[PDB]
Ligand binder design. Sequence first.
Ligand SMILES: Cc1nc(N)ccc1Br
Ligand SMILES: [Cl-]
Ligand SMILES: [Cl-]
Ligand SMILES: [Cl-]
Length: 163
Amino acid sequence: GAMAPSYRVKRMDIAKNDEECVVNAANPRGLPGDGVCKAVYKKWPESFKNSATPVGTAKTVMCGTYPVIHAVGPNFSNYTESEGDRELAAAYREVAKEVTRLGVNSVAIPLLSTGVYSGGKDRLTQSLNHLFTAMDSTDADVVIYCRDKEWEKKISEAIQMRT
Ligand SMILES: Cc1nc(N)ccc1Br
Ligand SMILES: [Cl-]
Ligand SMILES: [Cl-]
Ligand SMILES: [Cl-]
């Protein structure tokens, strides 16, 4: 792991990340999809070979030697809040498991279920807190990727708060 494991946030395309592996905000079917999943498909197409996996699970596929962790958050359009929250928490726990297994010293990670899977609600706080819950026991440097200027500020504040 990292000498002094940290959390950082950057506002840029997760496809340009400077970490040793990437988490895809995947769909259950391994399809190219939209947003983060679309940028990941353009950058690491070979990682979509057998990436299909259930909601609340993560599955890694190697693009050369660069690991892509396909993590499937719930679509809050189809889930109840209660059940959605359970599955979102589970996606992140499976990401922490995979980051450990792979022995990386850094990971680029997006906020699962905050885009087209959000059911039209702001889930920054909800998703970030499940991220921290899962990843706080890992020693990898975590870099969170986002695209909104206000979200960058709010994620930045939440990281500094607990430091
Ligand atoms: C970090 C990121 N990258 C993309 N390419 C699309 C959406 C988001 Br959020
Ligand atoms: Cl960019
Ligand atoms: Cl999403
Ligand atoms: Cl964003």
